[PDB]
């Protein structure tokens with residue numbers, strides 16, 4: 001679990017969004033595993049605006065933050081896991097690292113701020129849903 005709190009927005013994994021998130025929906029895209037809802041209180045996170053390929057991510061299944069190199073956001077075939085079937089996911093970045101389903105929502109960050117959130121994993125890779133192209137998170 002986990003979310004990004006930027007301005008009056010809450011960014012979560014679409015597959016983990018709550019009824020309150022859907023009832024206060026700003027934007028969602030199933031192909032990216034992202035959902036954005038509106039909040040009453042403002043948040044403290046800053047979104048990175050950059051093309052970094054190195055950063056640090058939080059892994060809840062290890063209680064640890066790990067430094068990683070990751071690929072640029074791409075359309076990737078995600079293999080079937082125990083709870084979800086094989087499917088294509090867009091704006092996804094991959095790194096070599098540990099992840100389990102419950103790690104989704106952990107932040108990946110670079111020197112410029114939040115890059116994305118853990119969204120996929122398996123075969124020793126962790127995938128992050130990018131948020132750096134969502135420029136509107138910075139206003140209104």
Ligand SMILES: Cn1nc(C(=O)NCCc2ccc(S(C)(=O)=O)cc2)c2ccccc21
Nearest residue numbers: 014015030033081099100101119120121122
């Ligand atoms: C980190 N990590 N995550 C997963 C995982 O299954 N994520 C769900 C991926 C997912 C995205 C979008 C939808 S949608 C919006 O199309 O319904 C459903 C599912 C995973 C598995 C195995 C090891 C690691 C893992």
Ligand SMILES: [Zn+2]
Nearest residue numbers: 050052110112
């Ligand atoms: Zn950066």
